[PDB]
Structure formats: C-alpha cells, structure tokens
C-alpha cells in the first residue's frame, strides 16, 4: 500500500526538481539531471556526471516530505555502448543542507543496482525513509555512470 511511483517517469516531478553534482555535455548529447527518468527515450536520455567517480550524485527534491519505500534504477544504452551503475549509496535531507546516509545492518547500505543498461532494478528501503530530498551516490559502474530512476512511496 506504499509503493507508488512518485513521478520521475510520469514527469509529475518536474525538471527543476532534479539536480546533480555535475553533468556531461558534448556536441552529441546533454546528459542533464532531469533526463534521469525511468524508461526515457531519445538521444539525451539519462543523467551522466561530468566525470566518473564516487564523488558524484543525483538529487531529487519532492518539495515536501514524503515516505520513500523504494528506488528503481536503470542505466542507458547509448548507441552501441552500455552504461550502468552497479552499486550506490543513498542520502537524504529535510532541509537540503544536512544529509544522512541510509544505514542497514550497522553500516552505510551499499545498494546493489543494475546488471544491464535497460532493465530496471527495484531496491527497497526498510525502514521507510521520511524525507524531502533524496541523493543517489554511484559507487561502482560498468564503463560510465548513467542513471534513469524512479522513486516509490507514499505520503509522510
């Protein structure tokens, strides 16, 4: 009863609500944070950071506190090149300034993500996370960091 998609795919979460540490842009594509939407199609259809390393993150602002019970991630196939995140951390905030890493079994939870570019993987957050902001912190990846996502939950 609390696993509704919050709006990444449907665009109920608007472009302005999605930001990142950095993003990659060249003459070919602009891999903006707001392209990080599950199942999005087109030439620029994922978020990619400017550089590949664990200091990078993607942020969503729900603009009120929500109950988050899951996140869904996907990579992207760009031309003939597979790109996906294999492992990631989550952090959260109510005020946008002070952040908290999601813990499980006594340590920061390392979420196991994707195994290809195109198939979604759902990761449950237990206990549920009550938060206004959510950040995803890629830790490992195949070839390049690329993300399309969804957030699952309900009202706080």
Ligand X SMILES: N=c1n(CCN2CCCCC2)c2ccccc2n1C[C@@H](O)COc1ccc(Cl)cc1Cl
Interacting residues toward ligand X by CB under 6 A: 54, 139-143
CB 56, min distance to ligand X, A: 11
Query: Rounded to whole angstroms, what are the CA distances from 108 to 71, 91, 103, 124?
Result: 16, 10, 4, 15
Pairing of strands 18-20, 121-142: unpaired
Closer residue to ligand X in complex, CB, 15/116? 116
Closer residue to ligand X in complex, CB, 33/75? 75
CB 10, min distance to ligand X, A: 31
CB 43, min distance to ligand X, A: 23
Residue 49: closest CA among 148, 149, 144: 144
CB 147, min distance to ligand X, A: 14
Closer residue to ligand X in complex, CB, 27/80? 80
CB 144, min distance to ligand X, A: 8
Q: Write the CB contacts of 128 (distance below 8 Å, at least 6 apart in sequence).
A: 2, 67, 68, 69, 153
Q: Which residue is nearest to ligand X (CB)?
A: 140
Closer residue to ligand X in complex, CB, 5/54? 54
- The answer to whether the beta carbons of residues 89 and 110 sit under 8 Å apart is yes
Closer residue to ligand X in complex, CB, 17/52? 52
Pairing of strands 100-101, 81-93: antiparallel
- The answer to whether the beta carbons of residues 89 and 112 sit under 8 Å apart is no
């Amino acid at each position: 009863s609390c696993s509704m998609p919050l709006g990444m795919e449907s665009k109920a979460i608007s472009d302005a609500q999605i930001t990142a540490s950095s993003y990659f842009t060249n003459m070919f594509a602009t891999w903006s944070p707001s392209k990080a939407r599950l199942h999005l199609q087109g030439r620029s259809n994922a978020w990619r950071p400017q550089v590949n390393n664990p200091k990078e993150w993607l942020q969503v602002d729900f603009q009120k506190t929500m109950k988050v019970t899951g996140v869904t991630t996907q990579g992207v196939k760009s031309l003939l090149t597979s790109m996906y995140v294999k492992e990631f951390l989550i952090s959260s905030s109510q005020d946008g300034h002070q952040w908290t890493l999601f813990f499980q079994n006594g340590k920061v939870k390392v979420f196991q993500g994707n195994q290809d570019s195109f198939t979604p993987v759902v990761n449950s957050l237990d206990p549920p996370l009550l938060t206004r902001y959510l950040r995803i912190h890629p830790q490992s990846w195949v070839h390049q960091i690329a993300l399309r996502m969804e957030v699952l939950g309900c009202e706080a």
